Write a protein that binds this ligand. Structure first.
Ligand SMILES: *P(=O)(O)OCC(C)(C)[C@@H](O)C(=O)NCCC(=O)NCCSC(=O)CCCCCCCCCCC
Ligand SMILES: *P(=O)(O)OCC(C)(C)[C@@H](O)C(=O)NCCC(=O)NCCSC(=O)CCCCCCCCCCC
Ligand code: FES
Ligand SMILES: [Fe+2]
Ligand SMILES: [Fe+2]
Lengths: 74, 81, 400, 103, 124, 402, 81, 124, 74
């Protein structure tokens, strides 16, 4: 399940305890994460799902919904 | 600043995750993360530029050593299983 | 599948930064540093002089005070034998410790065979010498005092600054073996009043087969050279200086000077983790050496009623070391653990854990789990454990 | 203010010489013919004023200067009681001192 | 470490103990001359002169554990006279022990002899 | 633009095969060879034994006769000092040559201060010792004879086999410094009756800071250890064995055994090329050393009326060496040239040329051309050349100053 | 096995000319050519296979050393101008 | 490899000889080949009493050739009394000669003095 | 001129004195060249002109004319 795997990756990367993660929570505003956190979250996404994410789409990935849409589309 | 530093951080992490040795991969990843954590609140642009230069030189060293270790590789450790 | 490395006191892995500094001199700049007529020798000499400055910067000293050697063994030999032979007409007495390294102890034994008088200072049950015993051991004809900074077996730090103050008050040269302390704890030859210091390359994540010795110039300490030849290294150590090795030594010293405070914090946290996790799950485990004056990277634990080499054999996926007399080629017991007053039963049960720069929490937890399970197994196997659990005291039992 | 010293030449001859406080050991030799060269003439640059001081009186001498030690390092037949004659000044403590000239 | 020593440790054969109060059990407990090696070797005898069981417990090196385990294996199935013939030479030839390791085989032989003498003394 | 390297006698470049062999132990196999309980130590020890076997195979000895050191200086110190000190109760006399390397000469002079008697054998104008003098210099209390195989300054070869047969007849231990001969000319310790041999790693395209000494076991030769410690290397050299360095030394010895026949042939043709082209274009050029007993790789030439250091300064594009006092930090003239009866005028004019495995024909031709043009330029600048061309005699000419 | 030997010779020559250092490049090319010419008349297939295996190991060594010398390169010699 | 020393070596300025058989030419020749540095410094004093030309030929180390060239440059176009004022210290300072190579500067000073003395013993 | 350069390359490689090479001279029979010299000639041709010759087309290069046609075609 892509939804569960993405949520698990985000929770493991950001310490959100798997319950503060939702389909409308931002990485920085809602969850406690900085840009350095965001870079390794995106790198962990690229590690789990084999995909060379371009920089443009990487900066477009700012929320859990955006990450889920990207992974489901690719 | 923000953009260049973020890109350098991403390149350094990418290159360090390619270490063949467990002693070298984990230490490099952990050291990069801790150094970018400790230098998050620097304000002096000269100090920032010096840090970026140091990171660039360390990136070069990492690229060379990672490739040399890929040339001379060995068996994984017992904990990587 | 290779095992984990937890034996950093024996030798350390090469730092990739040190290897990256070494390789250009192993590929392109292969000239002799003593060749004064061409660019090959000029650049090799420049690299050597930079390496010397890096080592001096690390130990807080003048670059002209640094002499490159082939290791801490030769550095200790130079220090001890050279000082003793140079100041022979007036000074014929030497002072060292019973817990010193084998190179120092063997140099002292050879000098004793050479007609010198050597006093071996006992230590307390904590591994630390008695400063009052040091002051009461100094004679008007005493030449040298040698106390190591960090012990390679139990990891206890000696009061180096106090010892150096005493020696400078009594006008006695003070040599310290810092092969386990350089790049790991702060060192300043001037604040500590050190006259001679030994440095090892492969204890600081540098290349093997290279070392250095510090010799003070104000006030000038003089040694009698042991290696004869063409007067390289100010005439104190003859023979070609290996340029890649000295460059690696300088790179390692610079990297250590930059990384010391982070490494010490990380290693201390990992050492607390290991010690606490081993103690909370295994009864009758004792740490060898005093924790108050202890370097956290060398951990020595005795597992009662379990033999050290049998435990090492059980821990086949972890590279470790033991003070057991059965791991020695000559069946030699641990003289350090005899000096610190450990019973022989617990001295055959000692395991040395090494936490270094590249050690991970994963490795530490894996080692702790494996140790717990295998010690439980060997204790269920052990007749000493049987008798102790069956209400019997080991001392009262007759042994043949 | 008279201090008596003993000069031992390169061939083991004790030459009793009488000097006064404030004199130079190197110059106290040529006046009485003890064959010390002292080419640089107290410029601390030649180290041909090399001399062996007696063990008892060696500790009384003031610490050698850094340039004096630099010269002493090169000096042939260096010993633990080796000093430079140009830098030794006779003092009342130096009564009975013996100066031996290196080979 | 040798294959046989590693096998003899990794696979326990007769690690345990036997009731000392039982009349048909002989117990030996000896120690190395210049190291911390201790072996407990115990043998059991049925109604006839045959050894039906033998258990060991060893505080010592891996080679000493292996020596005691081989000793208990060889002792099991023999009689007292057939077990008095076992020597440290045979144990060392089985385990391929280096010269620094002969103390374990000698200690195992000593444990065997002590257990047999103990059996005779209690059966008297 | 870097200069050409023609100074192989000072040190050699690392062979790429040697570096390839060394790299795995600088990255993955970093264990201590003396670690008795874990696999890192076991693999390091296996590599060390393999390298020891390689060195023994190169010199035709048993592996147990090889002791690793930090270089040929340490090997010479161990040999001379340990042999002298072990047998000093009955043997107080040593024999060596005046053209030996400074490590051997300095060890002998330091033994003279310890109470030993040392005889320095003179050499002929060819640079070869006379065997009758060696036989006449041996005393009933003679301990050691030390003659180097290939001279590092002029490249002459001593009759090692005859010296070994004389020493065995007189029951005297024979040591040879082979740091310039290992991997270059055939060596066999048993056929040459050699008791001790010194080996340098970086003279045979191996790593710096590593060496070896051969000590014969039958009949047993015993030395007094100089480095005290934990009793490593059969108690003869204490300290941790540098596994990458000894692995590189063994790899160097294996490559040298395979490549010595090709290297020697092509180095001989390059040396013949160089000498013939310099001689045919420059008058008053003299080779130092007997051409008969000479190793082609080490060429020492004197260019009359041109000082050595100025010629070296002219050849800023070629890395070379000289034997001039002006190149020495202490203004020390070459004692090897003085020992072979070279007059002081030509001692300051000597240049050493080095040809190795990695030398090309293009480098030799370029060096010859530059040398010819610069010697002509310097001779046109020289007053000695001016007087000689005038018909005047420099020897009769007394010197207005010194 | 003529085609295999020719292909191995071509690969060894191509890889050796990529050596950054002048001495290593010239020595490798000359040594490969001389070694292949000196064994042109070998008839025993076992010896031919042994030589082929030796050449394969040498080719691997050459590849690794050429690349690591490319990672750490210096200025050219005066003769290469 | 000082810039000033090799400057005079690759571009030596007054290399040559002069007529020893001349009334207005002084010839100096000092040093020995056994020592390793020999210099021949020649001057030509005009009718006005001011050196107009100077030539040198030097057998020796590069610092000696640089010192000889600098000496020929300095003593040209000056009075004999002014030429005597040149010391080896000035040449060593200009060429940055290390202490080991001061023999070159002293030898050049002696060569200048010898040429001046030859003129002072020939002009009469 | 390609025509002169190809013949000149062959002249360096095979030591032909520049006279023996014609438009119909074979490498093996007419000139002194075994397979080892032909491999070295093909590599030299690939170096003078920075054109890489496939192995199949390299096999076809047996005479001077074949090399001339190959170079002119590409
Ligand atoms: P994000 O929160 O939007 O942005 C985070 C950053 C840090 C970019 C932001 O807070 C910022 O702009 N901070 C200002 C200061 C700054 O830029 N800090 C970082 C400067 S670059 C730096 O710290 C270099 C660190 C070098 C690490 C070397 C590692 C060596 C490893 C060797 C292994 C062998
Ligand atoms: P051509 O006339 O068609 O001939 C082609 C060949 C030679 C293949 C043909 O004549 C033949 O079949 N000959 C039989 C013998 C033979 O083929 N021998 C070759 C064996 S492989 C060989 O020669 C190995 C060479 C190894 C060189 C190693 C160099 C290492 C360098 C290290 C430092 C860089
Ligand atoms: S005279 Fe030269 S140092 Fe005293
Ligand atoms: Fe044991
Ligand atoms: Fe000179």
């Amino acid at each position: 399940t892509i939804e569960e795997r993405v949520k698990k990756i985000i929770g493991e990367q950001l310490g959100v305890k798997q319950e503060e993660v939702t389909n409308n929570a931002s990485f920085v505003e809602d969850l406690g994460a900085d840009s350095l956190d965001t870079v390794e979250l995106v790198m962990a996404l690229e590690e789990e799902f084999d995909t060379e994410i371009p920089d443009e789409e990487a900066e477009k990935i700012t929320t859990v919904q955006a990450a889920i849409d990207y992974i489901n589309g690719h | 600043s923000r953009a260049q530093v973020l890109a350098l951080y991403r390149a350094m992490l990418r290159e360090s995750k390619r270490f063949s040795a467990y002693n070298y991969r984990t230490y490099a990843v952990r050291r990069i993360r801790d150094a970018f954590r400790e230098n998050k609140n620097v304000k002096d642009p000269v100090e920032i530029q010096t840090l970026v230069n140091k990171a660039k030189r360390d990136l070069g060293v990492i690229r060379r050593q990672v490739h040399i270790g890929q040339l001379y590789s060995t068996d994984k450790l017992i904990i990587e299983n | 599948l290779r095992p984990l490395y937890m034996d950093v006191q024996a030798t350390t892995p090469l730092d990739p930064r040190v290897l990256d500094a070494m390789l250009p001199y192993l590929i392109n700049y292969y000239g002799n540093p003593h060749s004064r007529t061409h660019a090959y020798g000029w650049e090799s000499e420049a690299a050597m002089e930079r390496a010397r400055q890096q080592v001096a910067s690390l130990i807080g000293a003048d670059p002209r005070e640094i002499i490159f050697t082939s290791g801490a063994t030769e550095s200790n030999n130079i220090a001890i034998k050279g000082v003793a032979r140079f100041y022979r007409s007036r000074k014929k007495h030497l002072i060292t410790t019973q817990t010193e390294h084998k190179c120092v102890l063997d140099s002292c034994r050879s000098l004793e065979a050479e007609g010198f008088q050597v006093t071996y200072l006992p230590v307390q049950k904590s591994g630390i010498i008695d400063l009052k015993e040091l002051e009461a051991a100094i004679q008007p004809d005493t030449s040298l005092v040698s106390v190591m900074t960090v012990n390679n077996e139990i990891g206890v730090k000696q009061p180096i600054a106090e010892i150096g103050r005493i020696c400078s008050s009594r006008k006695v040269y003070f040599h310290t073996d810092a092969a386990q302390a350089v790049g790991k704890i702060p060192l300043d030859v001037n604040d500590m009043k050190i006259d001679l210091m030994s440095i090892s390359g492969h204890k600081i994540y540098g290349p093997k087969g290279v070392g250095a010795i510090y010799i003070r110039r104000r006030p000038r300490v003089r040694v009698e050279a042991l290696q004869s030849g063409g007067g390289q290294e100010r005439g104190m150590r003859s023979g070609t200086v290996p340029t890649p090795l000295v460059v690696g030594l300088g790179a390692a010293c610079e990297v250590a000077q930059q990384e010391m405070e982070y490494d010490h914090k990380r290693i201390s946290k990992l050492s607390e983790r290991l010690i606490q996790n081993i103690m909370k799950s295994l009864p009758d485990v004792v740490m060898n050496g005093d924790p108050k004056h202890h370097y956290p990277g060398c951990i020595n634990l005795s597992f009662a009623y379990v033999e050290g080499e049998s435990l090492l054999m059980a821990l086949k996926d972890v590279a470790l070391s033991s003070g057991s007399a059965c791991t020695s080629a000559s069946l030699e017991p641990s003289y350090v653990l005899r000096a610190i007053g450990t019973d022989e039963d617990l001295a055959h049960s000692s395991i040395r854990f090494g936490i270094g720069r590249f050690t991970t929490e994963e490795e530490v937890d894996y080692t702790v789990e494996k140790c717990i399970q295998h010690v439980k197994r060997l204790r269920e196997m052990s007749p000493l454990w049987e008798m102790v659990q069956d209400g019997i005291d080991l001392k009262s039992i007759k042994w043949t | 203010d008279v201090v008596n010293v003993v000069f031992v030449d390169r061939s083991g001859q004790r030459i009793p010489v009488s000097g006064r406080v404030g004199d130079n050991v190197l110059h106290l030799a040529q006046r009485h013919g003890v064959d010390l060269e002292g080419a640089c003439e107290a410029s601390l640059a030649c180290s041909t004023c090399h001399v062996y001081v007696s063990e008892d009186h060696l500790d009384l001498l003031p610490p050698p200067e850094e340039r004096e030690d630099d010269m002493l390092d090169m000096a042939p037949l260096l010993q633990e009681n080796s000093r430079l004659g140009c830098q030794i000044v006779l003092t009342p403590e130096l009564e009975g001192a013996e100066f031996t000239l290196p080979k | 470490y040798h294959k046989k020593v590693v096998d003899h440790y990794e696979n326990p054969r007769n690690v345990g103990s036997l009731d000392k109060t039982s009349k048909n059990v002989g117990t030996g407990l000896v120690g190395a001359p210049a190291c911390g090696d201790v072996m407990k070797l115990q043998i059991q005898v049925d109604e006839k002169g045959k050894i039906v069981d033998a258990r060991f417990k060893t505080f010592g090196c891996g080679s000493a554990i292996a020596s005691s385990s081989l000793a208990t294996e060889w002792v099991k199935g023999k009689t007292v006279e057939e077990a008095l013939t076992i020597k440290n030479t045979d144990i060392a030839k089985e385990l391929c022990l280096p010269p620094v390791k002969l103390h374990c085989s000698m200690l195992a032989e000593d444990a065997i002899k002590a257990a047999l003498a103990d059996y005779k003394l209690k059966q008297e």
